[PDB]
């Protein structure tokens, strides 16, 4: 009966850092994806394994929505087959992903003239993430893998800050990102 709560995801007040990305399960509801695809608003709206404008014709077992912020130049890493600090150490899509990646510029809500440094990303890690893996640890990193206690030689804090200012070019501006994963294997999320 009830409509899927895409508004609570896309219009949420607070989005997380990409290393601490958050997931909402969407189930047992009617999804009208034209609220997404019939709008001109997204800077990125890329689907994999599925056509955006055909979503209202399909039923899925579940839909997942993953939310986070990255700078504009990093949105390209939120795709199957990419590498880079974001895809490798923060948020990884599988090569055979079925779903859509949506992103939009949020300069006036996530940046400020004096600079917003609260959004973070992981830049050091022993090994790449598996697809949809999340790592929210904050363990001092050493290249030899041995434990270390900052401040010390060859010991590094693994998270770094984005610095979001209103005055930078768009590649450095903040973008909110929602990744919709469509699960096939009884369907609970259907178009109208």
């Amino acid at each position: 009966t009830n409509l899927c709560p895409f508004g609570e995801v896309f219009n949420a007040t607070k989005f997380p850092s990409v290393y601490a990305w958050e997931r909402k399960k969407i189930s047992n509801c009617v999804a009208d994806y034209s609220v997404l695809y019939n709008s001109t608003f997204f800077s990125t709206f890329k689907c994999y394994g599925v056509s955006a404008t055909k979503l209202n014709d399909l039923c899925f077992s579940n839909v997942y929505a993953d939310s986070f912020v990255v700078k504009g130049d990093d949105v390209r890493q939120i795709a199957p087959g990419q590498t880079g600090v974001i895809a490798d150490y923060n948020y990884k899509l599988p090569d055979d992903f079925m779903g859509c990646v949506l992103a939009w510029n949020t300069r006036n809500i996530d940046a400020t003239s004096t600079g917003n440094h609260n959004y973070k990303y992981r830049y050091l890690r022993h090994g790449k993430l598996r697809p949809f893996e999340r790592d929210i640890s904050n363990v001092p990193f050493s290249p030899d893998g041995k434990p270390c206690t900052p401040p010390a030689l060859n010991c590094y804090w693994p998270l770094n800050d984005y610095g979001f200012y209103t005055t930078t070019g768009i590649g450095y501006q903040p973008y909110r990102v929602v990744v919709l994963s469509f699960e096939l294997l009884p369907a609970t999320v259907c178009g109208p």
Partner: antibody
Framework: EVQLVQSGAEVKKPGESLKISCQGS????????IGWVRQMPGKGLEWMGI????????RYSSSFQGHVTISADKSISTAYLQWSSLKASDTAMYYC????????????????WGQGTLVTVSS | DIQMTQSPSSLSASVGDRVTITCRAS??????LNWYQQKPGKAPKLLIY???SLQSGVPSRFSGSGSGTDFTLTISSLQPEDFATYYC???????????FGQGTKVEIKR
């Protein structure tokens, strides 16, 4: 019900410090931006700034950070507006207001408002 | 900076009249336009947000339209409790630049 309750009317002399407050109830205080609005006598409305409680995130309007500090103590669901050295020109009504939220790439206005705090500054 | 200018600054109307108040922004603010009501001595009240979305509890005789630089608040049939001052406010910018219009006072014609 959502309620914002402000501290009472203030009468101060120029050069004095002053901290007024606004306590939210009936909603998750750490989940909404809350901010302050000035209405000088006979004049319209001006945002002073907003704060997201329980994050470290205060966003001032215009040049207000040079004269006022906005802060919050999430542990008692209270937002504050404070001056270190008042001027007679600070005489005004001050409102606290909860920001409804955001959508797409911009903001919503204030959905719930406090009752107002009158501040008179005079020698 | 974004300047918000309302027209008219004052309007005299009768109960039952259709009332239109306009708000112009000095640059495009997309849909991020809010309207408030304020009566003497009382706090502002949000009527409309996102240019045309009615805040819960506000009567449907209030409606908003427009986009970009030009916006309208319409009261389809003015009622006795509607005589008040109305403000627009853009919320497109960062909070550093949020701005209100100067107000439109709707008074009773006699």
């Amino acid at each position: 019900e959502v309620q914002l309750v402000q501290s009472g009317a203030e009468v101060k002399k120029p050069g004095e410090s002053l901290k007024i407050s606004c306590q939210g109830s009936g909603y998750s205080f750490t989940s909404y931006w809350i901010g302050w609005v000035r209405q000088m006598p006979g004049k319209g409305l001006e945002w002073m700034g907003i704060i997201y409680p329980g994050e470290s995130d205060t966003r001032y309007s215009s040049s207000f950070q040079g004269h006022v500090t906005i802060s919050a103590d999430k542990s008692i669901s209270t937002a504050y507006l404070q001056w270190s050295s008042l001027k007679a020109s600070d005489t005004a009504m001050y409102y606290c207001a909860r920001i409804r939220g955001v959508y797409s790439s911009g903001w919503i206005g204030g959905d719930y408002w406090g009752q107002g705090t009158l501040v008179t500054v005079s020698s | 900076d974004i300047q918000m200018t309302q027209s008219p600054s004052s309007l005299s109307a009768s109960v039952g009249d259709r009332v239109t108040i306009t708000c112009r922004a000095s640059q495009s603010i997309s849909s991020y336009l809010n309207w408030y009501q304020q009566k003497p001595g009382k706090a502002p009240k949000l009527l409309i947000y996102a240019a045309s979305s009615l805040q819960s509890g506000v009567p449907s005789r209030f409606s908003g339209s427009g986009s970009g630089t030009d916006f309208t608040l319409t009261i389809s049939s003015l009622q006795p409790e509607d005589f008040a001052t109305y403000y627009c406010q853009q919320s497109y910018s960062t909070p550093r630049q949020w701005t209100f219009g100067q107000g439109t006072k709707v008074e009773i014609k006699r």
